[PDB]
Every structure is written in C-alpha cells, then in structure tokens.
Symmetry: C2
C-alpha cells in the first residue's frame, strides 16, 4: 500500500510543457483547453484558495500520522474530514497515464465539494451533471470554458431541467427511452443526443440497468424516433454499475456500443462520441490498471477509427481515496449478553450523515482505532436518538474509552454528497492537505 505515487504526478504535469517542447507522451492532446503551464498555475491557485498544507510521506500509516497531528469556530472533539486534494490530482494523473484516449468528465453527484470541482476543472476534466442544480453549480463557478464541456448524464430529466440546460447553452444530453426523445426534441432543439444502453452489471457494487439503459432490442425504435422528432444522435454511452471489478463487462459493453454505432448510420447518424461511463474503483482486489488493460485493446480495435472522441464519467475514482473521517468516542456503556458484556459506544457521526453510504452505496467502511486493549463484543452508534444509527453491531473489537478517536479512510464518495442533517448533526470541520508535491 503506497501513501502516494509522486512519479505519475510529475509526468502528468510535464507532458505538453515547454520543458519537453510541447510534446505529449501519446498521440493524444492533453485534456482541456489550457496549456501545460496554464494548467499547473490554475491548480496552485486553487491550493492557495483553500490553504492547502502539503504533507508528504503505507496509506494507513500516512493517515494515522496526519490524524494524530490534526486532533490538536468548532469544538476540539467535533468530527472532521481530512481532505487530501493531492490524491485527487494523483488519480487524474493515474487516469491520463493509463487512458489518454479517454477524457474524464467528473460526475458531480459523487462529491460536489467546491474545492474538488475546482481542482478537476483546472486539470482539464469535463463535467457530468445530473440536475439543473448541478449544471448551475458548474456554470455559476465558471469551471468550464464552454457548455460543450458538460454532459447531462441523466437519462430521465424533468422538463424544467431540460428548459434550463437549453437556456444555459448545454448540448450533450443522455437518453434511453422513446418518451424522452420527444421531450428532448421539444425543450432542447440544440441537443446532441447520446444513447445509453443496458449492460451485464450483475458483478458491480451498485447495479443501475434496472432503472437506466435502453436494451439492445429497443435501440432500433429509439433510433427511429430520433430521426422522427428531428433529434441529432451524436453518440452512445453506458455504465457497468458503480464499483464494478468485472473486466469482461467493460469489454462486453464496448462491443455492444459498436453494434449500435453501426445501427445508427442507417437512420442518418454519424456517431462522434463514446462515453464509457464510470465504475472504476478509487482505492488500492481488481485494480484500475487491470481494467484499462482489457479496455485499451478493444477501443483500439473498434474505435481505433480516429473519427470518434472517447470520454468517461468517473465519480468514485477521483474522490474515494481523498477523504478521511475522524470521529470522537464521546459516550459508552456496558450491557449483559442474554458475565458476557456488550460494549456500546457513541460516536459523533453515523448513518444519518456520512455513513448513509452503508445503505445507499452498500459500503462497508473501515473502522480504525487511532492508538491501538482486549477484544470486546462491541456495538458502535452515531449521535442521533435512533437505534438504527448504528455502524457496528455486536462484533469483536478493542475495548475503547471516552476521548478516543476513530479514523475512517476512503470516505470521499457517496457519503457527504447524499448526507442529511437529521437531529441537526453534521460534520463541518475540514482540514485540507496534499500528499503530492506541486506548489512549493
């Protein structure tokens, strides 16, 4: 387990720069409209904005060290997040290194923290918005040069959302059903439609073919309707389901997408664009590398055309490893199993807030006792008056005591995003750090 991969970052930043004669390390322009010099500047600006304290070196030990340091308006026992914006940059480097053909459009949904949106803008990523609110948060902070840099990746959108994307100049919008075509034709006449197709996502963590993605069969009627309502079908997308380690799935989807491209021509549509969506893991089994190994060949084969630009929509990739949550053990009490003793503890974050992922994301986060005392049957609860606000139930774990801290790493995705403010408890304190050298 590595605390960082300086190497990649270096290379990432160098490519397209004067210090290598504007030379790219693959056939492909660096992502974004900025020059390599312009890009390194824009990023240092953001780091300054958010008072990012650089802090260089295992990942676990990097976190345990940083946590001891950050424990000593907000209270001293309050819960807080250490956000490594360096790990975000590193993930962007790791992605260019492995898939330069593919330009990442970050999925805002996964963590819309303004610093994270700002870093990714400056690194040349595009934006995947699912609502009028997400569109307005990208345009109102001007994180793009153009509304061509936003994909509206919600196959099913309200009419007031279609209207506000039209008026904002947004173009690239998803579809997967007949009734949706009609709507796009109407509210977005300036629309470059992309067809989302179904996948064999049964291997994922979160499988979305249930709700979204036209099945292979229906593609034909969908195409037919696009021609009919005067809708410009400029591409094909897919998602193999969030947190999917199945490599066969990505291969399979590209194939299916090819056969569509073929079908599209017959209706008067030259497809420019191939969106391979998300599902790539953000934490160090199946690696992101192993996945790219099996994708690059296939992109080469069928979309090694050259006539078609290739894009992605990762969310979890970028943010998951970035965040560590710190929670104080502020209360405790012991019970009797039915002298066998249950040790119950009460921590200042939980299901209603950061740990909603346990339910919406099927997450199983790691609970790290900061200064590891015998193995107790332990139960841990969040601050709320509800008994279901429980993150661990009657499972072995060290006896703890009050004042102790829990460190939860890899909490950057689908946690705060969706988190609510029940019983009026939120985690507000944010410590920004960087694990990577950039801005001296």
């Amino acid at each position: 387990s590595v605390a960082s991969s300086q190497d990649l970052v270096d290379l990432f930043f160098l490519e397209g720069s004067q210090a290598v004669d504007g030379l790219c390390f693959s056939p492909y322009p660096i992502y974004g409209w900025r020059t390599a010099e312009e890009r390194r500047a824009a990023v240092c600006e953001v780091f300054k904005t958010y008072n990012v304290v650089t802090r260089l070196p295992t990942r676990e030990q990097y976190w345990r060290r940083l946590s001891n340091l950050y424990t000593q308006a907000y209270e001293p026992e309050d819960p807080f997040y250490i956000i490594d914006l360096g790990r975000v940059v590193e993930q962007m480097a790791r992605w260019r290194h492995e898939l330069p053909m593919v330009r990442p459009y970050f999925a805002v949904k996964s963590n819309p923290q303004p610093a994270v949106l700002e870093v990714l803008s400056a690194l040349g990523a595009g934006f995947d918005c699912a609502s009028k609110e997400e569109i307005h948060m990208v345009l109102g902070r001007q994180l793009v040069a153009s509304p061509d840099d936003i994909i509206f990746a919600n196959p099913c959108k309200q009419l007031g959302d279609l209207r506000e994307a039209q008026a904002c100049g947004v173009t690239y919008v998803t579809v997967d059903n007949p009734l949706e075509m009609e709507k796009i034709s109407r509210l977005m006449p300036s629309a470059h439609a992309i067809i989302r197709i179904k996948t064999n996502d049964s291997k994922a963590q979160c499988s979305f073919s249930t709700k979204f993605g036209a099945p292979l069969e229906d593609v034909e009627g969908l195409l037919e309707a696009a021609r009919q309502f005067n809708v410009t079908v400029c591409g094909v997308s897919f998602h193999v389901g969030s947190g999917n380690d199945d490599q066969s799935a990505y291969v399979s989807a590209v194939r299916d997408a090819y056969q569509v491209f073929q079908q599209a021509v017959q209706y008067g549509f030259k497809c420019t664009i191939l969106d391979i969506g998300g599902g790539f893991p953000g934490t160090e089994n199946t690696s992101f590398e192993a996945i790219a190994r099996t994708i690059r060949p296939v992109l080469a084969e069928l979309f090694g055309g050259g006539d078609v630009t290739i894009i992605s929509e990762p969310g979890r990739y970028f943010t998951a490893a970035s965040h560590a949550l710190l929670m104080n053990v502020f209360a405790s009490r012991t019970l009797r199993l039915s002298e066998p003793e249950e040790y119950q503890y009460y921590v200042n974050d939980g299901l209603y807030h950061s740990f909603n992922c346990i339910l919406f994301d099927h997450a199983h986060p790691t609970l790290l006792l900061l200064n590891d005392r015998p193995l107790r049957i332990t139960t841990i609860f969040g601050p709320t008056c509800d008994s279901m606000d429980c993150i661990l139930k009657k499972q072995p774990f060290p006896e703890m005591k009050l004042g102790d801290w829990l460190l939860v790493p890899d909490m950057g995705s689908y946690t705060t995003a969706a988190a609510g403010f029940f019983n009026g408890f939120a985690t507000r304190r944010l410590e920004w750090v960087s694990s990577v050298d950039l801005c001296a």
Copy 2:
C-alpha cells in the same frame, strides 16, 4: 375518516378564557405561560406570518380537492408540500382533551420546520431538543419564556453540547449510563437529571431500547453514581418506541417508572417529573384515544400523587398528518417481463429526499393517483441517477402517463427532517393551508 374535528379546536381555545370566566375543563392549568386570549393571538400572528390560507371541508377527499387546486420562483411541474398547520393545532387540541395532566414537549427531530416550531410554541408546548443545534434553533427564535421549557432528551450527548446547554441556562437533561452521569456532573452542575429506563418496545415501528434506556437492574448503580457526583435526579423518562400501538407497553412503563421513584428516595432524591416520551400515532388501527384510556387510570393510581408534574415528548403525533407531498410523473418507459410489460415511471422525489423514511422509519407511505386506466405491473423511481431510488417495485397499479401527479398524504414526520440533497434534488415549494377555523 374525517377531514377535521372542528369541535375539539373550539373547546381547546375556549378553556381558560374570559368567555368561560378563566375556567379550565379539568383540575389542570392550560399548558404554557400565556393566557387563553394571549395564546389565540400568538397563533393568528404565526398564521399571518406564513400567509396561511384557511380551507375547510374524508381526509383523502380533502387532500385530492386541495391538490387539484394547488397544481395551478419554482417550476409548474416541481414537487411541493401542502402543509395543513390546522391539523397541527387540532392534534394539540386532541392531546389537551385526552391528557390535560400531561404537558407535551414537542420533539424537534421529527420535523423542525420553523412554522411548526412557532405554532407549537404559541399553543403552550415545551421543546424536546436532542442537539446543541436544536437547542439554538428554539432559543434563537425565542420560542420559550425560559430554558426550563427545554428538555435535552438525548441520553448520550457530546461534551460540546453539554457545555452549550449549560451556558444557555438549560437544565433538564436525560441520562441512562454511569459514564454519562460523570459528564453531566462536570459540564452541567446546574442540571436537573432525568433517568431514562428500558421498555418492552418489541411492538413498535421503531424500537430504541437497543441503544437507550437503563435496564431495571442497573438503575441502582446509576442512582448511586448520581448521589456520588453531586447530581440532582429530579425525575424518570421512557419511550415505548416510535409508532407503537401496544397499550400494555404504556401501562407497563409507568409501573416500572413508579418502582424507580421509590428506589430514588433512598439516595436523597424527591422525583418531581414523569416524562412518558413518545410513540403516539399521528394519523387516523390502534387509536391515540385507546392509548390514553389505558394510561390515565395508571397515572391516577401511582402519580395521582399531585406532587409530580407529568410531561410527554411526541414528535410524530403533531406533524405526521399535517403534510401532503405532491410529485409529478415526468418520465416513463416500458420493458418486458422475463408480451408481459413492466411500466416504469420517474417522479421528482424519492428515497434520497422525502422518502428516506422508507429506510430510517420503516415507513410504507401511500401512493395516490390524483385523477383515477388498467392495472399494470408498475415500478416507480425518484429523480436521482440511482436504481435503488425506487419507491415501488413491480406491483399492480394503474397505467399512468406523463404530466400526472402523485399525492402522498401523512408525510409530516421523519421525512424532510432527515432528507438529504443527493444529486442536488430537493422539494422546496411549500403551500400553507389550515383545515380549522381560527383566524377570520
């Protein structure tokens, strides 16, 4: 099913007024520090503040009518809530009529809408806060004459919360564990401690004895510790679990609470106060009346003392029936069961927001097709890009079409409270109405 019970409201307001010579209709002062005239005024003020449109008459048909009317800055298809603040008042009347001995302290957690907090303040209710944030929301809007009118009903609270309740002048605080006593003694020396005990809550909708409530046995050591850390034990509380229809449970708890009162004396504690917590249903099997029938006797028997004031902490009671959610069906598509056809629809609210109750509250809300078309295998989803944002899966229901509306009544409790803002979709539009005559 009745759209209102004018009768009760009338009586409620009359009692303690000049028009009946300041005469109460039971041995017991009207709730609150306001005179009956002062109380009716304060309430009309709030109704004016929130531009409440009175609208008098089944409950279902009252809602269906009001919904047709309210369908025609916010969009015309946006989701919205019709909030009947009259039903809140009515619930307060219904409670005085049935349990004048018992002063209700409203549990903010269940729905902290400022208009709901304001109405309940003006009707003479006290406040049940579970966090420093809930305490600050009641004091910062000055909804009490005194910090004696707030119970801090969180048996397990962070030290920064204990500190801020001490500095705010708050006194009445819950406890159920030794380690907690020590903490109260320290941060709150001005504390009037109330002991929470366990219950046989196995019949409830939401059972909280798992996390909270000292078991009968442990009471003795707890008492002992209170005497020891110089802590003033002024009472006993309990909760029979939220949405509990079991009448035996309320009888049982009062009994257990009595035996505690007895135990308390031996340590130097004269208990003033009996908090019967919550669990009372808010919607029209087991009725609220049936429950009061079995409680009043027992309160009479053991706490018909007269030396002891009796209080409650209902949350759901007050708010549940108050709110109706309206959601627009904005998209749809049909699939093939494995020509059997699944009809999938997409509505502008869902699991991540108002329908989180399906998961945290085990709610099973009612879905009402506004203008009821044959019975389809239907699946309904919320606006978010997640497949798990699904409120109905493959169950019979009328074929619908786009532009249709769904009415969900009885959504006032443990919905918006806890609701989050994932994918940046929230319900914001609020239509305030009243089902009860008061303010001409």
